[PDB]
Structure formats: C-alpha cells, structure tokens
Amino acid sequence: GETITLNLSEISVKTLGLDGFNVNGKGVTQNRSATVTDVIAQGGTLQGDGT
Amino acid sequence: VGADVTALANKIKPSSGTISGSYEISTGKSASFDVDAAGKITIGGNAAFL
C-alpha cells in the first residue's frame, strides 16, 4: 500500500527540445527580387503597362 | 450530345488545371510528348501548332 514513485524518464534529443540543433544553416536567408518572369510563371495575367 | 462535346473538353480542362509545366500528349499512336502549355500549347524550345 506504500511505494516510492521514482519518477525518471526521457532525457535525450526530441525531449530536451533540441531535436534538430543546427548552427550552420545558412543564416538569415534573403529573398530574390520577384520579377515579371516569376510573376507570369505563377499563372499571372497581363493587365497593362507591366501590371 | 454526340454532335457537341464542348462540355467534355470543359470537363477535362479544369482537371488539368490552369497553368503548369511538363505535359505529355499521345495523339496518334506513339506521340509521347514533353510539352509545356502555359495556356497556349508549346514545346521546349519552340511553339506547337496542330
């Protein structure tokens, strides 16, 4: 009727929260200027003077 | 309607989508294309008439 709850579990990655810990990546990636080629690529429709 | 299947084409066309890249057409018996239809049908490097 008496015991001792030992209460031990789960020290590892995916539980210490890292699970993907990365230092290299490439940093804060910056986008490239979207242009008329990319606009017309995504089903864009011509409207006027480059619009 | 045997004489008018414009609705058939207007059924197949939405299934294909609106704008996409590599398609394949097997008209005739052994066409086996690699076409790029951005609306009007074209081929890699040139146009595509019919």
Automatic annotation (TrEMBL), chain B:
<protein>
    <submittedName>
        <fullName>Flagellin</fullName>
    </submittedName>
</protein>
